[PDB]
Amino acid sequence: LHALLRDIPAPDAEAMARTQQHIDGLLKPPGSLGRLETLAVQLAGMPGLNGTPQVGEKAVLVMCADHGVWDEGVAVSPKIVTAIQAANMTRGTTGVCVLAAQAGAKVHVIDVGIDAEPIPGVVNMRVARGCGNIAVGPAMSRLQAEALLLEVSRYTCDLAQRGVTLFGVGELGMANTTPAAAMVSVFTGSDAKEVVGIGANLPPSRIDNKVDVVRRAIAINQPNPRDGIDVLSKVGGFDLVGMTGVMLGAARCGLPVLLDGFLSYSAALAACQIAPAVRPYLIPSHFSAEKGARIALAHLSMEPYLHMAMRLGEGSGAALAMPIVEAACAMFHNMGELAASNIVLP
Amino acid sequence: LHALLRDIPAPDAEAMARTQQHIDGLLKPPGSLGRLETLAVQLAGMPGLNGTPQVGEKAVLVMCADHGVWDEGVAVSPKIVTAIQAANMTRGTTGVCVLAAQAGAKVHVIDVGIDAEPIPGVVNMRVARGCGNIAVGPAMSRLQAEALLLEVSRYTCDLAQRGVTLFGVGELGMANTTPAAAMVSVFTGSDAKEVVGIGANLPPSRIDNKVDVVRRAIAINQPNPRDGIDVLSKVGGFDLVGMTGVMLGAARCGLPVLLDGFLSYSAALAACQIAPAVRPYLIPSHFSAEKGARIALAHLSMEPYLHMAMRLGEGSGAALAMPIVEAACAMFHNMGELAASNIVLP
Ligand SMILES: Nc1ncnc2ncn([C@H]3O[C@H](COP(=O)(O)O)[C@@H](O)[C@H]3O)c12
Ligand SMILES: Nc1ncnc2ncn([C@H]3O[C@H](COP(=O)(O)O)[C@@H](O)[C@H]3O)c12
Ligand SMILES: O=C(O)c1cccnc1
Ligand SMILES: O=C(O)c1cccnc1
């Protein structure tokens, strides 16, 4: 793991310089395509991409797990929904599935700790049958977290060997917005009330309790904000850990990762804490309608492209943004050149 | 024309009600897909769509024209760029072309008043060789405007007969951001300085002049804000007129139109002024980096989905948003049902 971290490549400034010059020469007023230009340059700097903005195969990794904190009354979805939806992922009927198909991306469902019998068709990396209840103790051990980080990162880089050049990250786990808020509070130093949202339709009246639970998890565990692994293990979850692992794996592989919503932001905070080198590989997708989104995003210094008021999770936002990534590539490779037309623009 | 306007259909509330109920039953927490749900419902209410969110063929209409106001020093692109780029549109090398291809949409280039010899391959609807210089008089006559509105609206609805279900609107015309700002100022009652932007890289030092020119156009012409046709003819342009005509045509046809950037917002303001019935058919795409964008958008009560800092025009933003429209459809038609899984969510 120390290996893995040490070995994350820095971006290729040379390729980036070349990209910028090429972009500037395209059939348009310089800088007119704004964030699409910036995206293209970012992509060009990713080693796994071969010095140019390009997209080969696309995969969306969905990390599923249950959480002990569900027992705290913080979630209105029945616990079993994780297992059910997990199965549905295999049938292509979920929101992420449908959006992925539309983007031409494959969905990989990974069980990192669902509290149910194994589900045929789902990738098995189960840590346990749900994580510990953070309100009264840690979600898991440091060991467990590190091992999952390792296993997921490996699985991720291995897909690269099969043609995947672009990843999307997602989750599925009833009550997971609670550990997410805890993480965000810890990393950003924001008070719980400012970051705790309604999750999956939590009734407004149940908010207070959710805020109390978050506070308790923190007081009780005393996670160290300067130690991302510390935080994840204590007040995170297996799913959260898994998402952070996708991030670490893609970065080590020198490939881009599209973030999703609130849960993904929390994992991203951890990833960057653990390895700042990860940062340049991440790509925001959309702006989650979850209350703590703005805070989380500010801390990652990220500005999402899509404003859809989405709050489903599963990596749905991630899939929705893939076409954008492809557009920056098409722009780069298929547009004509100013010089070729004899056009001269300031 | 009075006919045309009279005959724009209202949205089908029945279909919309049915859509909403179907959406609520999908495999997800109610309302979790936010703006994608709202979009789907909007689409369902469009008569030309057959009671359901669906997308058949896609077309992007690019209205090209020159403006007399170019002589006022308000644009740094050489006048000839309109004609050149217009030709390029036919070769598929422009930004809109590339983005359309990626969205699977066809680009239709229409010459409504380029100041050059006709361009083979381009649809010919030329009013004149460039419009009058608004700084010293009107862009054209009311007659001319009405006729173009008519011709474009017809051409638009006719495409519907060929399978097109979704339109994108765009333009090409050196100096066109000037008439655009004038229109915006007039419709919104905002002062010119607040709405005049850099257009295609206008040097910061040249701004003042642009603001003066806009003010003059207004003082000189005295356009009536309560008469959209009045405004377009006086301080608009052939391209602006043409975009408004796409809007009127799509609406009469009961079909959706995706807006583009700043120029498109100006045309949209006119369209809604002329016929409020048009409103429900319009769909924002992105949030233009042009200074007057926020003001224009506020007046249309619209919130774009995409934040790309784009400012190219041509209908580039429009094409970029098409996949989003398709995603709302896929969601609607391909997602599984809660009931089918036995899942019950508050
Ligand atoms: N709840 C859900 N039900 C059905 N399908 C879902 N897909 C995602 N979620 C979402 O709800 C969970 C977080 O919400 P909370 O903290 O309030 O429990 C996660 O599974 C998130 O993916 C779903
Ligand atoms: N300028 C352009 N050059 C080359 N390709 C272009 N495609 C769009 N535009 C853009 O620039 C024009 C408006 O900018 P202004 O008011 O400053 O002249 C329009 O043609 C707009 O489409 C282009
Ligand atoms: O922002 C998200 O991804 C989200 C918000 C609520 C519930 N599930 C996911
Ligand atoms: O917002 C736009 O569409 C735009 C802005 C500047 C120049 N051309 C187009």
PDB file of C-alpha atoms in Angstrom, chain A residues 27-36 76-78 81 84-85 88 92-95 98-99 102 200-201 304-312 316 320 323-324 326-327 330-331 334-336 341 343-346, chain B residues 27-36 76-78 81 84-85 88 92-95 98-99 102 200-201 304-312 316 320 323-324 326-327 330-331 334-336 341 343-346:
ATOM      1  CA  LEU A  27     -11.418  26.453 -35.738  1.00  0.00           C
ATOM      2  CA  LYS A  28     -12.759  28.838 -33.099  1.00  0.00           C
ATOM      3  CA  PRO A  29     -11.954  31.901 -31.076  1.00  0.00           C
ATOM      4  CA  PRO A  30      -9.293  31.007 -28.540  1.00  0.00           C
ATOM      5  CA  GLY A  31     -10.686  29.825 -25.204  1.00  0.00           C
ATOM      6  CA  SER A  32     -14.291  29.910 -26.507  1.00  0.00           C
ATOM      7  CA  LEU A  33     -15.011  26.326 -25.511  1.00  0.00           C
ATOM      8  CA  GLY A  34     -14.112  27.080 -21.886  1.00  0.00           C
ATOM      9  CA  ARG A  35     -14.249  24.109 -19.501  1.00  0.00           C
ATOM     10  CA  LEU A  36     -14.270  21.684 -22.410  1.00  0.00           C
ATOM     11  CA  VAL A  76     -36.156   5.465   6.139  1.00  0.00           C
ATOM     12  CA  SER A  77     -35.320   2.878   3.544  1.00  0.00           C
ATOM     13  CA  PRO A  78     -35.619  -0.673   4.838  1.00  0.00           C
ATOM     14  CA  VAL A  81     -33.067  -2.432  -0.014  1.00  0.00           C
ATOM     15  CA  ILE A  84     -32.397  -5.989  -3.399  1.00  0.00           C
ATOM     16  CA  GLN A  85     -31.008  -3.097  -5.408  1.00  0.00           C
ATOM     17  CA  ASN A  88     -31.235  -5.303  -9.541  1.00  0.00           C
ATOM     18  CA  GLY A  92     -29.860  -3.547 -15.595  1.00  0.00           C
ATOM     19  CA  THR A  93     -33.019  -1.968 -14.147  1.00  0.00           C
ATOM     20  CA  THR A  94     -31.470   0.570 -11.757  1.00  0.00           C
ATOM     21  CA  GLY A  95     -30.915   4.266 -12.470  1.00  0.00           C
ATOM     22  CA  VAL A  98     -29.895   2.732 -17.477  1.00  0.00           C
ATOM     23  CA  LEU A  99     -27.718   5.853 -17.561  1.00  0.00           C
ATOM     24  CA  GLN A 102     -26.979   5.211 -22.529  1.00  0.00           C
ATOM     25  CA  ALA A 200     -33.024   9.306   0.713  1.00  0.00           C
ATOM     26  CA  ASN A 201     -36.066  11.274   1.697  1.00  0.00           C
ATOM     27  CA  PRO A 304     -19.243  20.309 -11.232  1.00  0.00           C
ATOM     28  CA  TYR A 305     -20.392  20.563 -14.802  1.00  0.00           C
ATOM     29  CA  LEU A 306     -23.951  19.382 -14.288  1.00  0.00           C
ATOM     30  CA  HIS A 307     -26.650  21.012 -12.183  1.00  0.00           C
ATOM     31  CA  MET A 308     -29.487  18.462 -12.098  1.00  0.00           C
ATOM     32  CA  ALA A 309     -30.559  18.563  -8.472  1.00  0.00           C
ATOM     33  CA  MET A 310     -29.792  14.846  -8.462  1.00  0.00           C
ATOM     34  CA  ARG A 311     -29.579  12.821  -5.292  1.00  0.00           C
ATOM     35  CA  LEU A 312     -29.907   9.167  -6.220  1.00  0.00           C
ATOM     36  CA  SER A 316     -25.797   7.885 -11.669  1.00  0.00           C
ATOM     37  CA  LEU A 320     -24.446  11.108 -16.928  1.00  0.00           C
ATOM     38  CA  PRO A 323     -20.586  12.021 -22.728  1.00  0.00           C
ATOM     39  CA  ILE A 324     -19.057  15.257 -21.663  1.00  0.00           C
ATOM     40  CA  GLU A 326     -16.146  12.165 -24.775  1.00  0.00           C
ATOM     41  CA  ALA A 327     -17.116  15.551 -26.173  1.00  0.00           C
ATOM     42  CA  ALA A 330     -14.076  14.728 -30.079  1.00  0.00           C
ATOM     43  CA  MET A 331     -13.484  18.439 -29.964  1.00  0.00           C
ATOM     44  CA  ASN A 334     -12.148  16.211 -34.918  1.00  0.00           C
ATOM     45  CA  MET A 335     -12.251  19.971 -35.157  1.00  0.00           C
ATOM     46  CA  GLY A 336     -10.646  21.752 -38.089  1.00  0.00           C
ATOM     47  CA  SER A 341      -8.887  28.186 -43.428  1.00  0.00           C
ATOM     48  CA  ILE A 343      -8.455  32.652 -40.588  1.00  0.00           C
ATOM     49  CA  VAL A 344      -6.583  34.888 -38.184  1.00  0.00           C
ATOM     50  CA  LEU A 345      -8.113  35.695 -34.822  1.00  0.00           C
ATOM     51  CA  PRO A 346      -6.587  37.882 -32.123  1.00  0.00           C
TER      52      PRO A 346
ATOM     53  CA  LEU B  27     -36.858   1.860  -8.966  1.00  0.00           C
ATOM     54  CA  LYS B  28     -35.610   4.755  -6.842  1.00  0.00           C
ATOM     55  CA  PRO B  29     -36.508   7.065  -4.018  1.00  0.00           C
ATOM     56  CA  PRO B  30     -39.196   9.444  -5.215  1.00  0.00           C
ATOM     57  CA  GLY B  31     -37.838  12.668  -6.709  1.00  0.00           C
ATOM     58  CA  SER B  32     -34.213  11.450  -6.428  1.00  0.00           C
ATOM     59  CA  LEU B  33     -33.441  12.087 -10.082  1.00  0.00           C
ATOM     60  CA  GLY B  34     -34.418  15.753  -9.721  1.00  0.00           C
ATOM     61  CA  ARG B  35     -34.266  17.822 -12.919  1.00  0.00           C
ATOM     62  CA  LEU B  36     -34.147  14.680 -15.031  1.00  0.00           C
ATOM     63  CA  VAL B  76     -12.452  41.832 -33.719  1.00  0.00           C
ATOM     64  CA  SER B  77     -13.193  38.969 -36.040  1.00  0.00           C
ATOM     65  CA  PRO B  78     -12.848  39.897 -39.699  1.00  0.00           C
ATOM     66  CA  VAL B  81     -15.281  34.842 -40.994  1.00  0.00           C
ATOM     67  CA  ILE B  84     -15.823  31.098 -44.194  1.00  0.00           C
ATOM     68  CA  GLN B  85     -17.233  29.370 -41.136  1.00  0.00           C
ATOM     69  CA  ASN B  88     -16.891  25.037 -42.900  1.00  0.00           C
ATOM     70  CA  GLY B  92     -18.195  19.170 -40.554  1.00  0.00           C
ATOM     71  CA  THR B  93     -15.092  20.833 -39.078  1.00  0.00           C
ATOM     72  CA  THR B  94     -16.731  23.441 -36.827  1.00  0.00           C
ATOM     73  CA  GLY B  95     -17.344  23.100 -33.087  1.00  0.00           C
ATOM     74  CA  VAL B  98     -18.248  17.943 -34.115  1.00  0.00           C
ATOM     75  CA  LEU B  99     -20.483  18.138 -31.041  1.00  0.00           C
ATOM     76  CA  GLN B 102     -21.122  13.117 -31.181  1.00  0.00           C
ATOM     77  CA  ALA B 200     -15.562  36.769 -29.396  1.00  0.00           C
ATOM     78  CA  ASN B 201     -12.577  38.008 -27.486  1.00  0.00           C
ATOM     79  CA  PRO B 304     -29.343  25.753 -17.463  1.00  0.00           C
ATOM     80  CA  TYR B 305     -28.138  22.250 -16.822  1.00  0.00           C
ATOM     81  CA  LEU B 306     -24.566  22.709 -17.988  1.00  0.00           C
ATOM     82  CA  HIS B 307     -21.936  25.021 -16.536  1.00  0.00           C
ATOM     83  CA  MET B 308     -19.052  24.899 -19.032  1.00  0.00           C
ATOM     84  CA  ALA B 309     -18.046  28.537 -19.286  1.00  0.00           C
ATOM     85  CA  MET B 310     -18.741  28.150 -22.997  1.00  0.00           C
ATOM     86  CA  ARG B 311     -18.970  31.091 -25.341  1.00  0.00           C
ATOM     87  CA  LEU B 312     -18.555  29.799 -28.874  1.00  0.00           C
ATOM     88  CA  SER B 316     -22.545  24.170 -29.659  1.00  0.00           C
ATOM     89  CA  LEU B 320     -23.866  19.244 -25.937  1.00  0.00           C
ATOM     90  CA  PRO B 323     -27.641  13.494 -24.499  1.00  0.00           C
ATOM     91  CA  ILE B 324     -29.250  14.857 -21.416  1.00  0.00           C
ATOM     92  CA  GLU B 326     -32.047  11.388 -24.222  1.00  0.00           C
ATOM     93  CA  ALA B 327     -31.118  10.364 -20.694  1.00  0.00           C
ATOM     94  CA  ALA B 330     -34.074   6.336 -21.163  1.00  0.00           C
ATOM     95  CA  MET B 331     -34.739   6.820 -17.495  1.00  0.00           C
ATOM     96  CA  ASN B 334     -35.945   1.639 -19.224  1.00  0.00           C
ATOM     97  CA  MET B 335     -35.910   1.788 -15.457  1.00  0.00           C
ATOM     98  CA  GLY B 336     -37.498  -0.976 -13.412  1.00  0.00           C
ATOM     99  CA  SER B 341     -39.288  -5.659  -6.494  1.00  0.00           C
ATOM    100  CA  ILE B 343     -39.856  -2.385  -2.353  1.00  0.00           C
ATOM    101  CA  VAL B 344     -41.811   0.199  -0.409  1.00  0.00           C
ATOM    102  CA  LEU B 345     -40.356   3.655   0.074  1.00  0.00           C
ATOM    103  CA  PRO B 346     -41.970   6.534   1.945  1.00  0.00           C
TER     104      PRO B 346
END
